[PDB]
Here is the input.
Amino acid sequence: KLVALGINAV
Amino acid sequence: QTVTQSQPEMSVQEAETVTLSCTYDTSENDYILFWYKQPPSRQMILVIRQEAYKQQNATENRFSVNFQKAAKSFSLKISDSQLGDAAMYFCAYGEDDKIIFGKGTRLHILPNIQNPDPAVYQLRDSKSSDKSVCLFTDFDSQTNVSQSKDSDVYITDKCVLDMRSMDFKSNSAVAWSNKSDFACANAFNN
Amino acid sequence: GSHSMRYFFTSVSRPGRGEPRFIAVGYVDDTQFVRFDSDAASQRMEPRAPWIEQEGPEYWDGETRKVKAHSQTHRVDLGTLRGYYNQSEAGSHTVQRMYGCDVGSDWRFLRGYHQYAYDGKDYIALKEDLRSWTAADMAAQTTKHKWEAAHVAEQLRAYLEGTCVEWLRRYLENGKETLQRTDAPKTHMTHHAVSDHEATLRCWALSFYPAEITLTWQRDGEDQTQDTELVETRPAGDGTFQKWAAVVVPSGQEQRYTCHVQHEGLPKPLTLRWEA
Amino acid sequence: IQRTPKIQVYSRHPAENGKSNFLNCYVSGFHPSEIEVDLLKNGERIEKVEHSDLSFSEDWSFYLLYYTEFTPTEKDEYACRVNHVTLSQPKIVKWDRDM
Amino acid sequence: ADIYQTPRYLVIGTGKKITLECSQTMGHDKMYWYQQDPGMELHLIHYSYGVNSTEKGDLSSESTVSRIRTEHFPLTLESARPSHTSQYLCASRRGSAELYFGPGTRLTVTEDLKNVFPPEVAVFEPSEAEISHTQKATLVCLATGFYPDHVELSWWVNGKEVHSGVCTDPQPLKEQPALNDSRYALSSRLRVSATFWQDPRNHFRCQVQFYGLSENDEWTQDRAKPVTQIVSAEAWGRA
Here is the structure.
C-alpha cells in the first residue's frame, strides 16, 4: 500500500 | 460525500458548549484532518489540525477535538461559547493530494439576555425622506422574527449587538416600507 | 524469516517529445506485486502477483490515485532540479525514489527507508532514525529545509511504522502459500579448463527463493581472494533465482576446493567437492 | 554518474535439446534507463521478446530482464546484443550453455 | 510573508473575460482554488503540485489557470456567465498539511453593466420613546438600491470608526426578489447611551464602501458612472 501522506515536491 | 457534516445549522447560548459533528470516508490509513472557521469576513482561518498518526492531547485551546480513527469521526468541541464564534465551520480531509471540505455548519450564538424588554420603536425619520423605519429590540434570544409575508414590506433577520464598555448586549430586527398604511405596530406583528 | 515491502519509482523527462516517462513498482521481498507504466494503456496501478488481485476496486482506485500523485510530484521535481543545476530544457534527466519497511521473523517493524536520487546520484535520504535527513548536495540542502519545515519526516516515519508494516503483514498472509514458501537451491559444480596449467570452477545454485544467498568457495580455510568471482544474483524468470561463484586453479589439482552454499531453503549448509 | 550494463545470457532451466525453454538476458547495474536489448537466433534476430518492468538496486543502478520462449537444439546459436549510452558499439554476448 | 488575492471585488457582465490574481510569498508548492456559492459549499475547482502542474476539479469557465514564473496561481474565466457568480478562494499549502487562504474574490456577473448602481444611505434617529423607557438610543442605517451586493458598511463617531454597539445584517435583501438584476438593501444599527446621543457635541456617520465599475470599461448612458465610491449619511446629537 503506497504512501497517501508524505510525498513532497523537492 | 467524502466528508460529512450532517447538521447545516446549530445554535447555542452564550457561555455554553457545542460539539459540531464530522465523519469521513476513506480507504486510507494515512491522512490529515482539519477544522476551518469562516466568519462574515469570509476569511478562511485554520482552527485545529489533526494528523492521522497523532494521539490524544492537542487540543491546546478553548477548542478541542474528539478524533476517533476506527469510528472515522472528527468532532469539534467549542466551550465557553463567545459571540465571536458565530461563523461557518468546515471539516476537511487531506492527503498528498487533495484537501476536500465537508458541506459546512453555520453556527449561531444566542446572547444571554439578562433582562428582556421587547418593544417596537419607530425611528424618527432620516431627514425628511423615508423610508421611515421600524425597530424591534430587546427581545430574548429564543425569539423568532419571521420574514415579510408582503413584498412591499422589508424585514431584516435578528442581530446581536455588543456594548463592550457597558457589558450589555441586545437583539434587534429592522422593518421598513412605503405602504401608506404602514405603521410599526403592524410591522413585526407576525 | 525477515520480510520487506519496497516501492521503486522512476521518472525520466522526455524533452519536447511529450510528458515524462514514469515507472512504479512494488515488492514483497523478491516478488513484484504491482506496477505502473505511464506509457501503457490502462493508466492504472496493475497487479503482478496473484494474491494482490484479491484486493477490491477501492484499493485499485486508491493506489492508482496515489501513484499518479507520486508521478505529478516527480514531474514538478524535474522542472525544479533542472533549475537548481542550471541544466538545459533539452536533454533527459532522471528522478528516482524508493521506500519501504522491514519486519523481523516475528513480523514486527525493524527499519524503514525513503531515499531519492537525481541523475543516478544520491540526493536526499531519510536517515535510519527516521527523524533526520541526509543531504550531500547544496540543492538538497534547500530540499532538506523545506521538507523540515513541512514535517515530511514525521509523516514518512508513520507510514513506515504503520501503514507500511500492517499491509506488509496483510500481504504476507494473503500470499502465504508462495511468499512464505522457500525453494531451496539445486546445486552443482562444473569445471572449465582455461590453460593446460589452469582450471576454472563455477559453483551453481539454481531454482531458489528468496534471492538472499551466500556462496563461499574454500581451499580448506580460505575465502575470497582478488580471484573469487561472484556474479550478481539473477532472475530465472519463473520467480526463482540463480547465481554462480567461480575460482581459477592453476592447480592441475582442483582439490580440495570446496563450495559452500547457504539459504533459508536448506536446513543444513551444503558442502560441494569436485567430481570426475 | 553514468554506469555501464553488466550482461548475462542464460536459460531458465538447464538446457536439453528439443525441450521447450526460456532464454534470458539479464542486464544490470546500468544508468541511465534507456537501453537497447536484443536476443539473437544465429546472429539475427528474435521478435516478440518481452521484458520485466524497470526497477533498480540500492546504488540506483538499473536492472531489466529480457526473455522469450525457445526450444534449444545442439546446433542453433543464441546470443544477447546490447547497446547503451556507455557503450561505443553494440556488445554481443554469446550464450554458452556449458556446454 | 503571506498569501494575496486581487481584486477583492469585481463586476463584469456576461461574455467578458476575467482573471483573478492569487499570489503567495511563503515558498509553498501546492496551491488550490476553491469556489464558494451563496449556498456556502467549498468546491475544489483547480489545484497544483508546483510549477508546470495544473489539474481540474470542475465548474464551467476558469478551471486550469497557469503556474510558471512563481506561484502566482492566476485563475481565468474566459467568457463569464451568471453561473460564475460566487466567492473565489485561493489557498496555499505548507507541505501536505494545512492550507492558508487568501481573502477571496467576490465576483458578480451581471446580464448588463447598466444594472450597476451605488447605494443610497440614510441614517434614522433614535426614538424618544426608546430613550425614555430604555435610557439608550439606537441609530439605524439603511443602504438601498445598490447592485451588486459588494458593500462594506462601517459606523463613525466623532471621526473614528466604532465597533462596540454595532450590528449589521449578516446578508442584504433583494429589493425586487423576482429579478436577476435585483438591487439590494442593507440595514444596520449603532446603539449608544441616552446621554451620549443627547450630547450635541457628538457626531455620527454611517459609511458604505461600494465596489462597482472601474477605469477599464466603460460608460455611455447617464445617471453618473457607478464607479467604486463611498456614500455616507450623518446625524448630530439632539436634546
